[PDB]
Amino acid sequence: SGAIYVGNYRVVNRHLATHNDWANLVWEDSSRDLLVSSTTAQGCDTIARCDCQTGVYYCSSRRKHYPVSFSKPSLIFVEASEYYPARYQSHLMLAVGHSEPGDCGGILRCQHGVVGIVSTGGNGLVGFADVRDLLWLDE
Ligand SMILES: NC(=O)[C@H]1CCCN(C(=O)Cc2ccnc(Cl)n2)C1
Numbered sequence: 001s002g003a004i005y006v007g008n009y010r011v012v013n014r015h016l017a018t019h020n021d022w023a024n025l026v027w028e029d030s031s032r033d034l035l036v037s038s039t040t041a042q043g044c045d046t047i048a049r050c051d052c053q054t055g056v057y058y059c060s061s062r063r064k065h066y067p068v069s070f071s072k073p074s075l076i077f078v079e080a081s082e083y084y085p086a087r088y089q090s091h092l093m094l095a096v097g098h099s100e101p102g103d104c105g106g107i108l109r110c111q112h113g114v115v116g117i118v119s120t121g122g123n124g125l126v127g128f129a130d131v132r133d134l135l136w137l138d139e
């Protein structure tokens with residue numbers, strides 16, 4: 001679990017969005033596993049606007065942060081799960097690191113701010129849904 005709170009927006013994994021997220025929907029994209037909902041309170045986070053390919057992510061299944069080198073956002077095949085059919089997930093970045101299903105929502109940060117959230121993983125890989133191109137989150 002986990003979310004990014006920026007301005008009057010809450011960014012979550014689309015497959016983990018609650019009834020309240022869908023009732024306050026701003027934007028969602030099944031191909032990116034992202035959903036953004038509106039909030040009444042001002043958020044605590046800031047979004048990176050950069051091309052970093054190194055950063056640190058929070059891994060809830062280890063209660064620890066790990067440093068990672070990650071690939072640029074791209075279209076990557078993701079096998080079928082209870083949440084989605086087999087498909088290509090866009091704007092996804094992979095890195096070598098530990099993750100389990102409940103780790104989705106953990107934040108990946110670089111020196112400039114939030115880069116994205118854990119969205120996929122397995123066999124010593126961890127995939128992050130990028131949010132750096134969503135310029136409207138700040139404006
Ligand atoms: N974005 C998706 O299609 C995911 C939806 C939930 C299921 N899924 C996974 O990858 C599950 C999983 C295993 C190990 N580590 C992590 Cl962070 N997630 C795929």
Ligand SMILES: [Zn+2]
Pocket residue numbers: 048049050051052110111112113
């Ligand atoms: Zn950066």
